[PDB]
Design a protein around this ligand. Structure first.
Ligand SMILES: [Cl-]
Ligand SMILES: [Cl-]
Lengths: 203, 207
């Protein structure tokens, strides 16, 4: 099997105020930098074979702490980059709700149908992360793989892994510096642990 | 929303050797007794409104610790009882694999089509836990509900909660004295946390 460890980036400077980032690239927050160290300590217990990360700072810096703790390299991977939120990028959740209430409603209620104006469709995110996961399954069979990514590609990944409709997108928790443990087996994928944050304690 | 905390019984005497219990009723192991206390300690940190438990000892004893820590009464619920494993009940996994390889293969490969001889179907389990969850959603809106159950009903519950086929049965981890946090929202259910065992520390066993 593949032991797949799916990690969300530690907290960015934009997360606590709820500003959509998409492809935009803020640094980790001070809290985030601490979260990443704690997560790296937590994952140091495991034998790791490979670490993939979205190339954006928040993910890459999180990946780098895990790699440094285990003396591995980080392999950048564009296919697990955050969705292009288009015009939402730079906007607070409250601003989106006020300026684009109907688009916000579609996002919450029927995420699978969304295409961000000036940006990417959720279908597109699903396609790219699924392709990545298929290649990982083949290439890294019988290994432990860490994948450092963001909310939207991660939630799409859970849909692909379970073989469920993209409409189930919101049914998975995805907190900063969390990890999930998936076993990619011969006939199915198994979510053994989802959205673990215990290592963060107070953070 | 409903904050639904789905808990698997702490370790029974039969869990570490892999003997199928079903409706057979073994005690918690000494380790499991400690697990239940650690879990109860963990869940004592937040407000709980109601605790439902399968009436089998392994679940009920786990539920009793959580209930006592919060000044609640355990509500016995037959609809979250373990599947009737029928002829497998009392057999080790390796014995089942040896004696009934075809039925074991069906169990692993196509769980949604399984029915244990002298026992219950997986479809039956799905039906009864789904009805239970529907009633919980209506009765306990804006409350925190603990449900103490077993691997098979819990896995069926995840299928029902996600509104997905019973063929996804095996795709969810379910360890002794673990908890999952689900939000039952208006339009969907969200698995916020699945199969959390961090509170157990050195007393955590996968198996
Ligand atoms: Cl989001
Ligand atoms: Cl089982």
């Amino acid at each position: 099997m593949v032991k797949l460890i799916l990690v969300r980036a530690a907290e960015s400077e934009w997360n606590p105020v709820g500003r959509y980032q998409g492809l935009l690239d803020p640094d980790l927050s001070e809290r985030g930098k601490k979260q990443a160290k704690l997560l790296a300590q937590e994952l140091s217990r495991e034998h790791l074979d490979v670490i993939y990360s979205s190339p954006l700072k928040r993910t890459y810096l999180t990946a780098l702490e895990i790699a440094e703790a285990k003396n591995l390299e980080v392999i950048k991977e564009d296919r697990i980059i955050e969705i292009d939120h288009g015009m939402w990028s730079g906007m607070l959740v409250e601003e989106v709700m006020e300026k684009y209430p109907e688009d916000f409603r579609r996002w919450v209620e029927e995420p699978h149908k969304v295409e961000f104006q000036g940006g990417e469709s959720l279908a597109s995110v699903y396609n790219r992360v699924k392709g990545f996961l298929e290649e990982v399954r083949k290439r890294h069979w019988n290994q432990t793989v860490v994948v450092v990514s963001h909310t939207v590609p991660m939630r799409a990944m859970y849909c692909a892994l379970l073989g469920v409709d993209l409409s189930k997108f919101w049914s998975f928790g995805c907190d900063n510096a969390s990890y999930s443990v998936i076993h990619m087996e011969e006939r199915r994928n198994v979510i053994l642990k989802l959205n673990i944050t215990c290592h963060l304690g107070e953070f």
